[PDB]
Ligand binder design. Structure first.
Ligand SMILES: Nc1nc2c(ncn2[C@@H]2O[C@H](COP(=O)(O)OP(=O)(O)OP(=O)(O)O)[C@@H](O)[C@H]2O)c(=O)[nH]1
Ligand SMILES: Nc1nc2c(ncn2[C@@H]2O[C@H](COP(=O)(O)OP(=O)(O)OP(=O)(O)O)[C@@H](O)[C@H]2O)c(=O)[nH]1
Ligand SMILES: CC(C)(C)c1[nH]cnc1/C=c1\[nH]c(=O)/c(=C/c2ccccc2)[nH]c1=O
Ligand SMILES: [Ca+2]
Ligand SMILES: [Mg+2]
Ligand SMILES: [Mg+2]
Lengths: 57, 421, 440
């Protein structure tokens, strides 16, 4: 029982840690993915502005 | 985190940049060629933040000098520290902008932007550990206002995890009487709220009022205004340019100063324009604010104070406690211990003791409302839109810029009205 | 054997490590180069000082320690400082970019890039040991590395070393010396995530040490140098049981049995005496009774709280120097009748004593007077929850408005982690309340 419970604690610490570190990498990547997608939406808007100058001449 | 990459854009940006580099080169013991001639080891300890070490012990600025108008290239190169700059880092266009934001941001500045990005990448790649970027510019012009904000958004794409800082010069009718400046500022603010980590509101109205009323000059030139800005910029970069026991970089300080991402517009201040209690009362006074807003019309979210000179630190601790006690209502109760202080041994040239002030006050809305009033005076009668709508823009984008700045003011007000219980 | 590996995380941990290791060296007669002339057995040994120092075949006595930080400038000063020869380069581990006063960067973003290296270097020290007892983790609550990297490290050390003991020396934040507005967050986060992985934690309140340096040592504006030297004296009193040979010397693990009545109630209040200047010490010998009485004066505590308005679950007295049991017993009998020492009904009221004959040492050019005798009291009092309360209140004021929370969320953290941490602290406060309540 002393071994079982010491292993249980090592087990669940390892699983809790891996679940957090993965969940964090999902979040931080989804945060940076949104930030770049807003910046790429500006490049698409600046392509419409530069077309509406040429298509008004 | 050590190396910062400086970028100066437009006439305003390049001249305040030039002055910035004159003062810190003097402080660090760098002569116009770029050799070390000082005495203290503290001058070289964090020299790498703003300078590259070339062959023959040559210290060269990490500066990128940018404009659509040539001629500004000559004035910087002819100036006192014109030789020290890197020749390839000069990236100058052809036909200028003529105080037009859509020229700087969407069309003519967009053609020059990739040639600037080359110099940024070349400087950034050589950095052992790049911390971030500082942009000196005005928001009333065309190039620094528009191409400066395009650079911000383009630098963000390739360096999303680096700090982006701006010394953004706010336009005022008392200094410059160009009529479309309220359009330029409002379009820039729409970019700055989204894409910068912290922005210093160096306001030309406050700099005029200081120069007129305090310094006694009847009609001040741009040279007089810049004496104050170079004193400010030297002050707010002291924490990065010298140690001592403080261990701070652009991110640490942005973390302690910016409690909400959009609310990153600070109120600078300097003193004197002397004893420690006088300094401390002077820097918190509205007359010494480089932004034209009254602290007492709102509340401080956070404050950073930075003293310079030989002085009793016990006395500085007592005096900073004194003003927080005496002015308790003007600091939000729901962020404990939000006023922080550093002391630097090395004073600036001329003064034995100085203090520099950085404040994230909800009163900054007084600056944004003033611009918003000047903006809406023109926009509601569709005046001067042919400058912008000709270059390709839509009225929708003009409405969005107004609405974003009105939201910014609404949010500053929300947290000013917020209470603990 | 019974080896003890110290791990020093962040600026506060590293700089406290320097104070501690400089101080141990002087206590054990170890030179800056690592030589120990009085040590006749070259290359190894089973002596008491070998619990903290391994020996090389060249006679070098090397700290069983690792210095970790996520930026180079603090550890660079050990690499180039007086004791540069004392540490192997592999014991001193630095990153390039710090955690920026952000728990998230220390635990996840920057911290995950160096964590495997750090554990590998701890493993080389562990394999030097014939009977490893445990770890002593020095770190701040407030720093991003101090809070975030420590938590990560403690989590991993529980995986790799099971239930092998892990002690903390945690630096609790104070506005006088701190420059970080987000410390309340970092503190609550690290305290929450480490709680299951620490067996005992000695908190040190910077304000408590700041006031002691001002009041007792007459230092107008105490620096970290002033605080760390005092802290190292307290740390030395607590580790002296492991590092020295003694007939009346009680082991630290034996005090721990008395100090930790339940796993979560593992935060002893430390109190040290005498802290006195050289001027005041001259023609002023302080008896056993005077320094023992000084332990119950709350101005001498390492954490600002009031034991008199709380309840005791343990009281341990760690004496060092010219001290004999007779005097200690007399002094205790005097204190019992004269002072506010109320125990809970489920504990026995007897004070537990340990004595080390090796007297306390001072660092040359210090502020402390060299004294013949000294004492450190380790008590388990419900009063220490006040420190949790003050810090939990600062957290709530900011978190209600989500102030600064975007910085943590930007680096990958969820709001769930904040409230989960605060609820654990709410429970911790409730636990300290419950243990004080009388039985039925
Ligand atoms: N404080 C200060 N303000 C300046 C300085 N030079 C220009 N300004 C202000 O900057 C605003 C105009 O922007 P400029 O920087 O001249 O224009 P630009 O960004 O170079 O754009 P273009 O002129 O179109 O190339 C006005 O409000 C001026 O008062 C200076 O040296 N100091
Ligand atoms: N007692 C003591 N406290 C310190 C020392 N250095 C820093 N602190 C305190 O520790 C807290 C700040 O954390 P640091 O340890 O400096 O930061 P860090 O752990 O290096 O983490 P980052 O710098 O954010 O990556 C504040 O409360 C400081 O006052 C020291 O030498 N002694
Ligand atoms: C403790 C102290 C005074 C160092 C502090 N705490 C939070 N902020 C600061 C100061 C600053 N904070 C900043 O964010 C800052 C910005 C900066 C520095 C250099 C270049 C551009 C911006 N400059 C500062 O001096
Ligand atoms: Ca030996
Ligand atoms: Mg121009
Ligand atoms: Mg640090």
């Amino acid at each position: 029982k002393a071994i079982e419970e010491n292993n249980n604690f090592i087990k669940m610490a390892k699983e809790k840690l891996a679940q957090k570190m993965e969940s964090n990498k999902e979040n931080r990547e989804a945060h940076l993915a949104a930030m770049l997608e807003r910046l790429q939406e500006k490049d698409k808007h600046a392509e419409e502005v530069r077309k509406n100058k040429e298509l008004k001449e | 985190m050590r190396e910062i990459v400086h970028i100066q854009a437009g006439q305003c940006g390049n001249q305040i940049g030039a002055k910035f580099w004159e003062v810190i080169s003097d402080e660090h013991g760098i002569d116009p060629t770029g050799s070390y001639h000082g005495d203290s080891d503290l001058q070289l300890e964090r020299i790498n933040v703003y300078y590259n070490e070339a062959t023959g012990n040559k210290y060269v600025p990490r500066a990128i000098l940018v404009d659509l108008e040539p001629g500004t290239m000559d004035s910087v190169r002819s100036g006192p520290f014109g030789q020290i700059f890197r020749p390839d880092n000069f990236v100058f266009g052809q036909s200028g902008a003529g105080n037009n934001w859509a020229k700087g941001h969407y069309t003519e500045g967009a053609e020059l932007v990739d040639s600037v990005l080359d110099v940024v990448r070349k400087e950034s790649e050589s950095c052992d550990c790049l911390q971030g970027f500082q942009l000196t510019h005005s928001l009333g012009g065309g190039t620094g206002s528009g191409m400066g904000t395009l650079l911000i958004s383009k630098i963000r794409e390739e360096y999303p995890d680096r700090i982006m800082n701006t010394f953004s010069v706010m336009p005022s009718p008392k200094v410059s009487d160009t009529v479309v400046e309220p359009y330029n500022a409002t379009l820039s603010v729409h970019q700055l709220v989204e894409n910068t980590d912290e922005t210093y509101c160096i306001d030309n109205e406050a700099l005029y009022d200081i120069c007129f009323r305090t310094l006694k000059l009847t009609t001040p030139t741009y040279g007089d205004l810049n004496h104050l800005v170079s004193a400010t910029m030297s002050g707010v970069t002291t924490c990065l340019r010298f140690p001592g026991q403080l261990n701070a970089d652009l991110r640490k300080l942005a973390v302690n100063m910016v409690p909400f991402p959009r609310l990153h517009f600070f109120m600078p201040g300097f003193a004197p324009l002397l004893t420690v209690p006088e300094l401390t009362q002077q820097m918190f006074d509205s007359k010494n604010m480089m932004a034209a807003c009254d602290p007492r019309h709102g509340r401080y979210l956070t404050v950073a104070a930075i003293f310079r000179g030989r002085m009793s630190m016990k006395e500085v601790d007592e005096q900073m406690l004194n003003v927080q006690n005496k002015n308790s209502s003007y600091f939000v109760e729901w962020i404990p211990n939000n006023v922080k202080t550093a002391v630097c041994d090395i004073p600036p040239r001329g003064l034995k003791m100085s203090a520099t002030f950085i404040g994230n006050s909800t009163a900054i809305q007084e600056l944004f409302k003033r611009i918003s009033e000047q903006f809406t005076a023109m926009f509601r009668r569709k005046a001067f839109l042919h400058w912008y709508t000709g270059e390709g823009m839509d009225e929708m984008e003009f409405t969005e810029a107004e609405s974003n700045m009105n939201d910014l003011v609404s949010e500053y007000q929300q947290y000013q009205d917020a209470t603990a219980d | 054997m019974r080896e003890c590996i110290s791990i020093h995380v962040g600026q506060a941990g590293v700089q406290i490590g320097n104070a501690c290791w400089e101080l141990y060296c002087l206590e054990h007669g170890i030179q800056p180069d690592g030589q120990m002339p009085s040590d006749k057995t070259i290359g190894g040994g089973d002596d008491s000082f070998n619990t903290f120092f391994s020996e090389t075949g060249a006679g070098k006595h090397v700290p069983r320690a690792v210095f970790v930080d996520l930026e180079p400038t603090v550890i660079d000063e050990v690499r180039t400082g007086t004791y540069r020869q004392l540490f192997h380069p592999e014991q001193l581990i630095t990153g390039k970019e710090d955690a920026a006063n952000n728990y998230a960067r220390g635990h996840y973003t920057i911290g995950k890039e160096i964590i495997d290296l750090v554990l590998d270097r701890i493993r080389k020290l562990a394999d030097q040991c014939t009977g490893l007892q445990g770890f002593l983790v020095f770190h701040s609550f407030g720093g991003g590395t101090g809070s975030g990297f420590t938590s990560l490290l403690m989590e991993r050390l529980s995986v790799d070393y099971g239930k092998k003991s892990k002690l903390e020396f945690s630096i609790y934040p104070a506005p006088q010396v701190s420059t970080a507005v987000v410390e309340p967050y970092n503190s609550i986060l690290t305290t929450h995530t480490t709680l299951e992985h620490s067996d005992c934690a000695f908190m040190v309140d910077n304000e408590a040490i700041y006031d002691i340096c001002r009041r007792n040592l007459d230092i107008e504006r105490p620096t970290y140098t002033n605080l760390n030297r005092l802290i190292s004296q307290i740390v030395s009193s607590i580790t002296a049981s492991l590092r020295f040979d003694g007939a009346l010397n009680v082991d630290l693990t034996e005090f721990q049995t008395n100090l930790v009545p339940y796993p979560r109630i593992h935060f002893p209040l430390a109190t040290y005496a005498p802290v006195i200047s050289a001027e005041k010490a001259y023609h002023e010998q302080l008896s056993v009774a005077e320094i023992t009485n000084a332990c119950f004066e709350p101005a001498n505590q390492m954490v600002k709280c009031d034991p008199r308005h709380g309840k005791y679950m343990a009281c341990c007295l760690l004496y060092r120097g010219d001290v004999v049991p007779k005097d200690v017993n007399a002094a205790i009998a005097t204190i019992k009748t004269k002072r506010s020492i109320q125990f809970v009904d489920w504990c026995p009221t007897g004070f537990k004593v340990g004595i080390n004959y090796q007297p306390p040492t001072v660092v040359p050019g210090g502020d402390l007077a060299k004294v013949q005798r000294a004492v450190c009291m380790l008590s388990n009092t419900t009063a220490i929850a006040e420190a949790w309360a003050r810090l939990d209140h600062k957290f709530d004021l900011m978190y209600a408005k989500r102030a600064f929370v975007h910085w943590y969320v930007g680096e990958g953290m969820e709001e769930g982690e904040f409230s989960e941490a605060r609820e654990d602290m709410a429970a911790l406060e409730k636990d300290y309340e419950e243990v004080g309540v009388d039985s039925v």
